[PDB]
Amino acid sequence: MREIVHIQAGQCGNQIGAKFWEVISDEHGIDPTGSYHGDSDLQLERINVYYNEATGNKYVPRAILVDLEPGTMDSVRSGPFGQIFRPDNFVFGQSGAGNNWAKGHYTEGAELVDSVLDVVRKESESCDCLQGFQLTHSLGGGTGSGMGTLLISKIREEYPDRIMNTFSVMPSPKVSDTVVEPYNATLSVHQLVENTDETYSIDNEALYDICFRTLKLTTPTYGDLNHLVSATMSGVTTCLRFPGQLNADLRKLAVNMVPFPRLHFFMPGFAPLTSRGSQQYRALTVPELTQQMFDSKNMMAACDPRHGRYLTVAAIFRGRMSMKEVDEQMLNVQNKNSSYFVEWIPNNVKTAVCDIPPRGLKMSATFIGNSTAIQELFKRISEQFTAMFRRKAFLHWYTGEGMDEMEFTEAESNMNDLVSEYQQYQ
């Protein structure tokens, strides 16, 4: 029943996916050993969406862990929930990609794509009614951006009709940790736009901005950014794992949220968000959730929505609430801020409400937005690419892998084409 098959690519992808697995195992009440320990039967009916039923009433997640290094596999298996995973889905090479997209897409990951495909196919045939694939990866470096796009293309080729949603942490200028990120991002979005039905753009800088300027953490580590990602990870698929008054699965979002086929790079967000010493004082009412939700500080990318127009926004609310105030805020936001939403398309909001709130939360709101302002990251990536493209650096480490100049040129042309379409409707 609407089974969803998860794939992890790169160290970023597999660690954030592992923490997502931890979060939704707590939501479904799954013991670290894999046994069920939840309180209500509501956690139990839609276990088949993320986990496989096995002997002893223990449940194994439908995740395929893919990497080119064994060290990340070693860390994840030794992590808090390493034991719950399938030993077979730990499919990995030995030599790393070295943050080389060409390595992952032609040499290093091409040999392991056969060993990942035979696992993803068995996972899919284990499903009763497959709905799609949620894939976690990073546009930075050559592992997540490199092999991730290749296997995404393969699964899209053999699964042409299933939903393809990807959550992509993507490079940024001021919190860049690797020199050669823009090549990787340009060569990755080239395949992401053509193949993926859904892509969530996540930028690390805005995660940092959330954890300082909203969460007031003095030392928010990398796991806290993983937590911020996993919150929306769990939120976007809430409707098809739990009952709610307005059920909106992934394709419910899709039919409402992407006006033209290529305009599918979106803006995630989550509410509520407070510091430790300020949650005691906050009124968690739904209107306040809304005023927090469309704030430019709550978002997870540097693209400020005030520099563009929203095409479609998705607000999947959660908890035991009525909904007239839901409609009134969703119309007030787009009425008083009608200059920030495309007036030519009148009702830019898709509303979904779930009946069971997250554990420890009385209510929650998950933000998904289509703004023309998201081109801020794309054109900046293209500009940084040009600053390292126009007269030939670092290309020997790609062309040595069989990579060629004209494909780089087409990738840049496609970035320019994308930013053109997203500026067209602004």
């Binding site: 008054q245 059920n247 899709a254 898709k350």
Partner: protein, 430 residues
Amino acid sequence: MRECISIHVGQAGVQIGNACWELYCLEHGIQPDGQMPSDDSFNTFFSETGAGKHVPRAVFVDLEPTVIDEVRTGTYRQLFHPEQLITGKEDAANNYARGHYTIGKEIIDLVLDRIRKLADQCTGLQGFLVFHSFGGGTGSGFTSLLMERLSVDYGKKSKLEFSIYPAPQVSTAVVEPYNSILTTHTTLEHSDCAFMVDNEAIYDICRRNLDIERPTYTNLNRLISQIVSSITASLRFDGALNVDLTEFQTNLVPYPRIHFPLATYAPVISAEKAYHEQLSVAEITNACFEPANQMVKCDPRHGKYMACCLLYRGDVVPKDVNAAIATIKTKRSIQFVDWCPTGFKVGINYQPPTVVPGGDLAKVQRAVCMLSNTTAIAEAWARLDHKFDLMYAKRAFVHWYVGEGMEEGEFSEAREDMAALEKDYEEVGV
């Protein structure tokens, strides 16, 4: 005798069914288990077996299981025939395209199979009461596929249409007008009398009359159920002037294509408010024509009445009905078309309204069901047509409809048909 098969399509249809049958079991005194503790007043809606069990003649069809298998878990899990409540595997994605060609295609054959096995025990089948929503993918596509085959397998039988219609301001999806426009061919060609439901108008109703600040859709349902039960009141209980379901629709319909009447219910009033009013027949008669009581956000004072049907129930004397309608025809603010100086059809039933114990509606000795066709309702379509233009002018979301097997020009036939309907409801007003 006098059986009616109720169809419930989409989430809205199945849940409005859950509320309607909740009302019916209470008013006819059936437990949630189907038993009768202790007249054939239930034969109109419920079938009887040898063991003393009341089995409803209803189908819950949803292309997704969540709401229906939630019904399989609720208090009415044993009331219904489990495999007459049909669930699909893939949701309709708020898309008319897949619901009408792709996903409903494999399931409709079982739906008509169950409809046939519901028809074959009905000795006096009167008509069909199908419930859905215009904006929903299932309620659009699957209903569009279903009335097509019902109109050729049960062409003689009347098909009443109770549909939930989008608001001028309140909306839950951006694709709702797309789903709504391709539904218009079904109501025009494969429906006999359609009843349109607006959520924002009834939101105002519950805000002003019920004094409740925070109702849910369940409060909406526990009044749509009253409106449908009041329409079916004459078929199930005794009355001085019982109106047959065919008599009803003959009184509503002036022309085969003009069969889209508004609905209002009175007295919609809270329990704290029922005490201080005597609640005469006249005031419930006067309250129905008040634009602040309309079920659809359109001003009747902006339009002209063609057919008027007074469906009273409870302790109402027909003399008081005549006295009220004399006052109604007395005021000029309510101007009827030059078609109907006779104006009013009167129907009286002896059963007082049945109150839901968890409801927000008061217990009143008298209740009236107002169903009227008017030219003012074209405004509820006069914003939807301009709305549909505002999306179709770029081909806003058509690649999905194209990608799921719909012809691109079906939108062209759709807005041509709505324009024809809008014209048809304007010439008759002269």
